[PDB]
Amino acid sequence: PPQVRPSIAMDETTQGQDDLTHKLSDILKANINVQKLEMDGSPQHIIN
Amino acid sequence: MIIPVRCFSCGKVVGDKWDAYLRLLEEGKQEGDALDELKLKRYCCRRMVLTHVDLIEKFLRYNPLE
Amino acid sequence: MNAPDRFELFILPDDVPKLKITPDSRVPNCIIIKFEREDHTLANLLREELALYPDVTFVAYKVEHPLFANFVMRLQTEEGTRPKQALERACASIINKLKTLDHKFNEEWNIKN
Amino acid sequence: DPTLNKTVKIRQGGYKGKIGIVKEANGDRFRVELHNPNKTIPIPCSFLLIESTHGWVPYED
Amino acid sequence: GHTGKKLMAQVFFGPTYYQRLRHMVDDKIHARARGPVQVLTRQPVEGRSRD
Amino acid sequence: GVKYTCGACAHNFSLNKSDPVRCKECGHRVIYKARTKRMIQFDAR
RNA sequence: UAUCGAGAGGU
Ligand SMILES: Nc1ncnc2c1ncn2[C@@H]1O[C@H](COP(=O)(O)CP(=O)(O)OP(=O)(O)O)[C@@H](O)[C@H]1O
Ligand SMILES: [Zn+2]
Ligand SMILES: [Zn+2]
Numbered sequence: 001p002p003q004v005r006p007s008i009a010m011d012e013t014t015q016g017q018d019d020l021t022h023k024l025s026d027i028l029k030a031n032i033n034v035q036k037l038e039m040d041g042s043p044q045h046i047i048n
Numbered sequence: 049m050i051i052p053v054r055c056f057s058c059g060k061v062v063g064d065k066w067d068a069y070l071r072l073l074e075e076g077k078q079e080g081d082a083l084d085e086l087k088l089k090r091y092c093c094r095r096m097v098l099t100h101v102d103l104i105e106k107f108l109r110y111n112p113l114e
Numbered sequence: 115m116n117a118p119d120r121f122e123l124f125i126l127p128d129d130v131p132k133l134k135i136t137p138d139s140r141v142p143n144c145i146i147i148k149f150e151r152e153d154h155t156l157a158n159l160l161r162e163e164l165a166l167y168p169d170v171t172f173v174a175y176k177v178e179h180p181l182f183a184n185f186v187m188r189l190q191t192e193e194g195t196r197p198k199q200a201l202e203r204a205c206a207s208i209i210n211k212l213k214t215l216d217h218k219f220n221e222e223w224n225i226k227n
Numbered sequence: 228d229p230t231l232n233k234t235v236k237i238r239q240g241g242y243k244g245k246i247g248i249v250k251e252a253n254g255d256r257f258r259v260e261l262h263n264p265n266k267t268i269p270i271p272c273s274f275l276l277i278e279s280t281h282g283w284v285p286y287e288d
Numbered sequence: 289g290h291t292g293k294k295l296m297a298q299v300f301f302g303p304t305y306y307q308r309l310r311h312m313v314d315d316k317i318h319a320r321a322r323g324p325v326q327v328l329t330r331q332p333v334e335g336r337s338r339d
Numbered sequence: 340g341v342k343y344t345c346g347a348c349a350h351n352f353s354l355n356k357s358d359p360v361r362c363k364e365c366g367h368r369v370i371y372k373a374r375t376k377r378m379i380q381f382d383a384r
Numbered sequence: 385u386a387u388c389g390a391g392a393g394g395u
Contacts, residue, residue, distance in 0.1 A: 008386050008387045008388095009385095009386060009387095010386065010387075011386090012385095012386095015386095016386095016387080018387095019388095
């Protein structure tokens with residue numbers, strides 16, 4: 001939950017996300033691209 | 049910064065002796081004798097004048113900011 | 115930041131007595147006097163004066179802490195004399211010696227003119 | 228209260244003649260921020276003069 | 289000074305050059321009852337300057 | 340509105356916050372606020 | 385009443 005990975009506000013109206021939030025975004029993006037290959041344009045050496 | 053009004057240790061007024069001390073030094077007197085003439089007898093009082101540094105002369109060179 | 119007002123050394127609060135006398139019942143005829151807003155100046159002066167009286171058997175004072183302008187004195191007199199009275203006498207005795215001293219200085223001063 | 232943050236002169240006590248500002252005036256006992264040393268003191272509201280249109284006026288402003 | 293009596297000992301006495309160092313007690317004194325906590329751990333924050 | 344002083348030529352002037360921040364006399368863009376209307380007291384200790 | 389760092393310091 002966000003209690004484990006809180007956001008911080010640098011200058012009142014500017015907020016950045018925790019390193020874990022960004023890293024889970026990276027896992028989620030990378031997960032979607034595994035779904036996008038095995039169902040269409042997969043050049044094998046790319047699936048790996 | 050500017051000559052102290054009183055000797056820190058005993059309270060004797062020394063802030064009226066700065067011009068007289070500089071004048072005695074122009075007239076060629078040695079520092080010890082100039083202090084003697086000014087009746088600065090205790091060495092606490094002598095330290096006040098002998099080791100003062102007149103920095104206000106430096107600060108005045110900075111063209112007033114109003 | 116935690117410095118007290120310097121006037122508290124000599125200005126007595128209205129609810130604070132200049133002087134408070136209590137007994138020391140451990141020995142006969144002994145009082146403890148607590149002086150507020152006073153110094154070694156008063157205490158040592160009274161102390162020596164009192165100690166030279168023949169009917170004073172014990173006199174002492176202490177400033178318990180230099181950061182607070184009070185002191186406490188202990189005074190014992192022999193059976194005949196009452197301790198508080200001996201203290202009154204020491205006050206008047208010293209006032210008299212200072213009156214004499216002021217007179218002799220005035221005279222000696224005109225002589226030196 | 229109508230005298231907060233308004234400039235004040237002290238007319239009784241050890242701080243007599245000193246300038247200050249009413250920092251907090253909850254009730255009867257005010258907190259005046261003295262100008263001269265960096266300290267805010269407790270003082271009764273009876274001890275204060277407030278500045279107004281004409282001179283220093285007691286707590287009738 | 290209390291009594292006017294001489295000291296039984298004589299005192300090494302004279303001028304020496306002394307320095308006023310940057311460390312002053314009212315720049316260091318600090319106390320906290322309650323106050324702010326960190327968002328992540330809810331433990332008190334670090335530093336005099338942050339209560 | 341508020342009195343300022345030019346950090347270069349020492350001219351005194353006012354600005355109504357919306358005015359640009361420069362001196363009318365020499366065009367200097369570094370200026371300093373003039374002293375308060377309030378009276379200042381010190382304890383001389 | 386931010387977060388991550390760095391540097392200089394105190395005992
Ligand atoms: N870098 C450090 N790490 C851990 N503790 C330290 C330290 N520096 C100082 N200390 C602490 O502070 C003490 C040092 O005291 P100092 O004032 O530095 C010397 P001393 O031995 O007491 O006196 P001296 O000056 O007469 O030789 C150590 O014993 C320890 O208690
Ligand atoms: Zn001296
Ligand atoms: Zn200009």
